[PDB]
Amino acid sequence: RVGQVTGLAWTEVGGDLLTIETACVPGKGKLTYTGSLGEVMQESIQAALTVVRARAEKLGINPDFYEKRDIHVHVPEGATPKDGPAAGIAMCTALVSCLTGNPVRADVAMTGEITLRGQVLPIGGLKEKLLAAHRGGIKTVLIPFENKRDLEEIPDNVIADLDIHPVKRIEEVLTLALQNEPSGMQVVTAK
Amino acid sequence: VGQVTGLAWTEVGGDLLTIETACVPGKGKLTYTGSLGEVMQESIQAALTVVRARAEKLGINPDFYEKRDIHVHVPEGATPKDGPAAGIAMCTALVSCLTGNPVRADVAMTGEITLRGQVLPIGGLKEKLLAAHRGGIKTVLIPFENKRDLEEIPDNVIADLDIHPVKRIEEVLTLALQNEP
Amino acid sequence: VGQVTGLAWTEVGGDLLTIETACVPGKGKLTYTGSLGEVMQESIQAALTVVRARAEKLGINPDFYEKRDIHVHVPEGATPKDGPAAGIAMCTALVSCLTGNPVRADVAMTGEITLRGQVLPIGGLKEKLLAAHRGGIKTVLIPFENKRDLEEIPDNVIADLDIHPVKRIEEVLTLALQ
Amino acid sequence: VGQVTGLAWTEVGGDLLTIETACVPGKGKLTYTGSLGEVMQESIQAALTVVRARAEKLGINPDFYEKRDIHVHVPEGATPKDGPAAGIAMCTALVSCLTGNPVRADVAMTGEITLRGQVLPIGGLKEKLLAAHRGGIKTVLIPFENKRDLEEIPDNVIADLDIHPVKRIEEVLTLALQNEP
Amino acid sequence: RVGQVTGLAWTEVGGDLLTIETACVPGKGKLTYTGSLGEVMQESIQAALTVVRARAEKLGINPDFYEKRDIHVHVPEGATPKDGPAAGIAMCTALVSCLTGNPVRADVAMTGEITLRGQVLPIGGLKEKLLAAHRGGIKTVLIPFENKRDLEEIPDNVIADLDIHPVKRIEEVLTLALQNEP
Amino acid sequence: VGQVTGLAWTEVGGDLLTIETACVPGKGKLTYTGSLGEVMQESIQAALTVVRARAEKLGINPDFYEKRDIHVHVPEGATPKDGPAAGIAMCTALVSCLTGNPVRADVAMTGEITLRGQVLPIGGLKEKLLAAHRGGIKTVLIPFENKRDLEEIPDNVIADLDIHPVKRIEEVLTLALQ
């Protein structure tokens, strides 16, 4: 479950469900991405990686470990075309995981366009993506805050089933999706 | 920091762009993303050269581009964008990212940049300001030579805007950045 | 070096292919050839990444790829080929190439591989097993989730062939490697 | 940043162009932008090699291109440009940039450059010279072999112009650079 | 430094005699290939070089030869489009010849698709290829073992003039084509 | 030095070409410009390999490949040029810029070069010789197998030219360099 995230984004078989895989192996700092990915989705991976790279210290990733590793983002089924910016936060979560050996919580799906500032941006086809996550057995679905309005025409059943967390920042997403806390050392205070 | 509100052409017309820049440990790679057309990609290259040429004067380490990677990104990722009007915005975002000097988030800017750092006039001035106005921008930087073009835009819109016509990049920086580079 | 009988889509002729891998002194380059469409090219990258993530368990020096170049080739050279169905063959071949452990010549295999090492189901099982049968292959490895598809394969083909439905790459390698 | 007024082909037709060059710290990289077609791109390369081969004679550090990058840019970024007619401007701009010898602003120039530093004739001289004239250019450098082409250009335009027919890049540099190289 | 082998392979105007040239000069490990070559034929050159690299030790070649050499494979005539895999064993032979200083027999031609494991695969258009061999005065032609069936279709007089050697593997090709023992 | 007159196909017709070369302080980059078609670009790569394979004997430091950048440019820049006919000129220009050995004036040459250094026959010899004539060329080097094509060339053109049928690159360097 390390480096495996369920994203909701566009496929040629509809705004279906994505299984995103990442690997971090010995190398020289090369990035590879595969899975019949359109250009917009490829650019989203680049944006997600950069988000990771800038937040490195805070994520505990040494830049001088990152440079002796190669990264491969892969999205099966490999023959099915996928595109759009909606897996950006899925991409970023998967990248953080594979770089940190921090397993991704299961029954968790996410959709959202990522920015370099760590802001999660509204996406399209919320309904379809959630029909997708429903027929998938996913409980927790992370969606962008500005998509909250779009919920009103999602069947209560779907809503009652899905533990839905609207999210504004990448910071919340990682905490919701990762086993351990990705950011900052645990400091315990008592009153 | 590393964020600038620019005004440029998008598939649906002149609009607000949030230009993002990040600067991380690397070996001199620049990446630019956001469904950018080729003319816009080139303005990014010109803006970076402006920053590189004026590097030492701006506080920046003139050897920065051999040890760091730069990503310029313009959301939203799927919306096509093009033209050279983001140029001074590109430059300001780069300076900001490389110095850590916050950008005033009440300021939008539009204009083509040259390697000499002069601000060239742009097209579709009406759409850009109408966009800036609807988005609640308080202060807008426009090319000096677009001054004439203001009179074709609703007075009620111009009256709401603090408009600074500019000739040179050093003016843009001083007006948009928080501190004094 | 590495050779595995894969079953995968081709524009012409049989869907039965020999996946070949070579590992030679180099600087860490990857080369893949054989009139490969883009999906099949990506499946090579996936397969390699699988092996690289398990080099230790597989008994391969984790930093092997530093001083080594890899060439993956899929004859016949001029026959257009594509699709992900050669994934597990490519992975098996690469392991064979890097360990020196030979692959059984009476075994064919077909399946799409994931980075996690799972074996995904493929299309055209019938045409694939016919190529395998016509080609004299004794044992055929197929995705577990293609189990239901066997229902529509000729009983003689079913009678003549030893079919092992598989789920993960560990099974493939155990069955295929000598 | 070296600036030279070139006359060269654009999508609107032969026109006055500002050629910009920047030499900044780098590792020998060449960048060229400004919606340039391939033939113009190749002229930049020919131009640079001319300078590179004549480095010491021009008083340039012969290994300058080892620790430095070059960006040649021709605004306006959006207007397509092509053809070889900016070659001598490119070469002049690079020489100006690498030596700090500022270019005269009363001078425009047009002509194809070769590696041996010969200036070859170009087409559309009429359009080019009318463009220099409308833009208030006093002095225009043209290839020696374009001399006869002057006769089909209105006399009233040519009488206003100080025209210098040139054969070699050394002539170009002497006439166009402020200080004697 | 320049290996030379006669291959029989496909050109725009049909299967033909090709002179395959290979150069190994002071370099850093680059591979260059030219001669209006289509992609399949470009791929056969990469396959043929890989065969040599994998077998360098057995060929008496320093296994690190490529780290300090550049290779250029060129197939004249420059303007004639050529494609397909039939020049593969010729490419391998030229590369081995060049790298080991083992000259190539001049009356020999060869056609055959090479594989990384070094097996020679059958090609098409044997008759067209063999006649070009015959016209060009070639005495010896190496052909793939599985092309034996196609010999029945070749005019009897061409069969009688040509010394035809059906080969299964690259070692046979090299033994038959190189002046010295591989 | 580094300037050779070649005869090769252009979009305006088989024409006279001024091949230019410069060898500059650098790191081993090859640049070739002049709106050159791929076949003509490939002839440049072939010509360079010939020089590289013979560097020592040509009094060229064999490590020039690593310490110098070479730019091959064929004006006029906007005129498309293609085909293999400039090969021997390319080789000659290259030897010249690397050796400082000047190229004779009033020499033009046409011919496809091979890596072994053989000169191969070209097409359009007649349009090529007519071009050499009007450009005021005295001596013209042609491939040996193009001798037969001389029997289509006007009497005066032939009378005016000193034509040398050549088999090999070393006759070329001999007849063309000082």
Side-chain angles (χ1 to χ4, degrees), chain E residues 84-119:
Chain E
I89 59 170
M91 301 286 189
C92 198
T93 300
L95 292 167
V96 175
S97 172
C98 176
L99 291 177
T100 61
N102 199 349
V104 172
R105 302 192 178 193
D107 53 338
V108 170
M110 64 182 80
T111 190
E113 158 166 359
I114 190 57
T115 56
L116 302 195
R117 64 188 188 264
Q119 183 160 8

Side-chain angles (χ1 to χ4, degrees), chain D residues 3 13 29 40 42 46 79 87 107 149 159 173 176:
Chain D
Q3 297 243 318
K29 294 184 61 61
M40 192 161 278
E42 293 192 346
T79 302
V107 180
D149 286 333
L173 296 173

Side-chain angles (χ1 to χ4, degrees), chain E residues 30-112:
Chain E
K30 292 180 182 205
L31 173 58
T32 300
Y33 37 78
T34 54
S36 303
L37 313 173
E39 267 193 276
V40 172
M41 178 169 285
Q42 294 169 24
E43 293 192 351
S44 59
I45 295 178
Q46 303 175 276
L49 180 52
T50 287
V51 168
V52 179
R53 291 164 77 187
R55 287 162 193 79
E57 266 127 334
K58 293 158 181 42
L59 289 159
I61 307 180
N62 163 40
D64 277 35
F65 76 95
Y66 200 32
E67 300 174 8
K68 59 180 302 197
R69 304 284 138 128
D70 281 0
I71 302 298
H72 186 163
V73 180
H74 178 67
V75 194
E77 291 156 349
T80 302
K82 310 171 188 74
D83 208 352
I89 59 170
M91 301 286 189
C92 198
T93 300
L95 292 167
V96 175
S97 172
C98 176
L99 291 177
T100 61
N102 199 349
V104 172
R105 302 192 178 193
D107 53 338
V108 170
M110 64 182 80
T111 190

Side-chain angles (χ1 to χ4, degrees), chain D residues 166-179:
Chain D
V166 298
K167 298 167 177 176
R168 310 262 110 170
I169 187 70
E170 23 279 306
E171 293 178 284
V172 172
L173 296 173
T174 293
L175 284 160
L177 302 188
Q178 165 175 305
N179 308 315

Side-chain angles (χ1 to χ4, degrees), chain D:
Chain D
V1 171
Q3 297 243 318
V4 179
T5 294
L7 312 174
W9 184 91
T10 75
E11 195 190 9
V12 333
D15 201 24
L16 199 156
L17 299 176
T18 295
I19 282 82
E20 302 195 298
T21 56
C23 184
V24 306
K27 56 168 83 155
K29 294 184 61 61
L30 170 55
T31 310
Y32 37 63
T33 49
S35 297
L36 320 170
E38 181 158 17
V39 172
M40 192 161 278
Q41 296 173 22
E42 293 192 346
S43 70
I44 292 174
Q45 280 173 297
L48 182 53
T49 287
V50 160
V51 181
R52 284 174 83 181
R54 297 181 183 218
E56 179 175 339
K57 289 172 178 177
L58 300 151
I60 308 174
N61 193 340
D63 311 288
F64 73 102
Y65 204 15
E66 189 172 1
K67 68 173 175 181
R68 300 212 177 189
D69 295 341
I70 299 303
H71 186 169
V72 180
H73 179 68
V74 194
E76 44 287 320
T79 302
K81 302 167 195 78
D82 204 2
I88 62 171
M90 298 296 185
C91 191
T92 298
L94 290 163
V95 166
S96 166
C97 183
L98 299 167
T99 67
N101 195 359
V103 186
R104 306 185 183 201
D106 47 310
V107 180
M109 77 190 58
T110 191
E112 166 166 1
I113 197 183
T114 67
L115 298 189
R116 65 186 153 260
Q118 180 162 357
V119 180
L120 295 183
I122 42 81
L125 188 69
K126 182 194 296 187
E127 272 181 339
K128 291 167 166 86
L129 296 191
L130 295 176
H133 189 278
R134 294 168 279 187
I137 298 294
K138 317 180 88 61
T139 304
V140 182
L141 278 50
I142 69 162
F144 190 83
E145 282 170 50
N146 282 124
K147 276 175 67 178
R148 183 57 84 85
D149 286 333
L150 294 179
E151 281 318 286
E152 335 303 339
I153 310 190
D155 294 331
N156 73 282
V157 170
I158 297 305
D160 281 333
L161 295 180
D162 178 37
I163 293 167
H164 297 262
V166 298
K167 298 167 177 176
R168 310 262 110 170
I169 187 70
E170 23 279 306
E171 293 178 284
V172 172
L173 296 173
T174 293
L175 284 160
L177 302 188
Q178 165 175 305
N179 308 315
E180 293 207 301

Side-chain angles (χ1 to χ4, degrees), chain C:
Chain C
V1 275
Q3 39 183 310
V4 182
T5 300
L7 308 179
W9 185 84
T10 71
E11 181 181 299
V12 281
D15 287 21
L16 170 126
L17 314 166
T18 299
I19 284 73
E20 299 186 296
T21 56
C23 177
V24 298
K27 318 160 177 178
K29 302 190 184 301
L30 172 58
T31 294
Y32 37 81
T33 49
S35 304
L36 309 171
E38 182 170 33
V39 166
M40 182 171 270
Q41 296 174 30
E42 300 192 351
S43 77
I44 290 170
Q45 290 180 291
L48 178 49
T49 286
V50 171
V51 187
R52 295 173 72 183
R54 303 156 143 86
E56 216 120 48
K57 352 189 295 186
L58 290 171
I60 300 165
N61 198 314
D63 297 315
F64 76 99
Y65 208 11
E66 279 177 4
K67 305 182 179 190
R68 258 51 184 162
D69 278 3
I70 307 297
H71 185 161
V72 183
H73 182 64
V74 195
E76 189 276 322
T79 301
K81 315 173 188 73
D82 206 4
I88 66 169
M90 290 150 174
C91 191
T92 303
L94 286 165
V95 170
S96 170
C97 190
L98 300 159
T99 56
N101 190 7
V103 190
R104 311 182 182 268
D106 55 331
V107 168
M109 77 184 60
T110 187
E112 157 167 5
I113 205 185
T114 62
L115 293 198
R116 73 204 97 142
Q118 282 202 323
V119 179
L120 296 197
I122 45 70
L125 187 66
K126 196 195 214 177
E127 62 201 48
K128 281 165 178 73
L129 300 179
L130 287 178
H133 189 236
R134 286 203 297 252
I137 289 306
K138 158 179 136 290
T139 296
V140 192
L141 279 42
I142 74 167
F144 185 93
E145 298 171 32
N146 276 116
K147 222 194 171 71
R148 311 286 317 270
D149 293 333
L150 292 179
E151 191 189 299
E152 317 297 343
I153 281 82
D155 300 297
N156 48 319
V157 178
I158 296 288
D160 203 280
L161 294 180
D162 190 58
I163 304 176
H164 294 210
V166 301
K167 284 177 258 176
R168 280 198 74 264
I169 188 68
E170 278 190 49
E171 304 175 292
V172 182
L173 297 170
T174 298
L175 286 170
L177 295 185
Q178 174 65 95

Side-chain angles (χ1 to χ4, degrees), chain A residues 43 50 53 113 115-117, chain B residues 20 34-35 69 71 76-77:
Chain A
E43 294 195 357
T50 295
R53 286 168 68 192
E113 166 166 2
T115 56
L116 296 209
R117 56 183 165 274
Chain B
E20 305 186 282
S35 301
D69 285 7
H71 190 161
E76 44 269 339

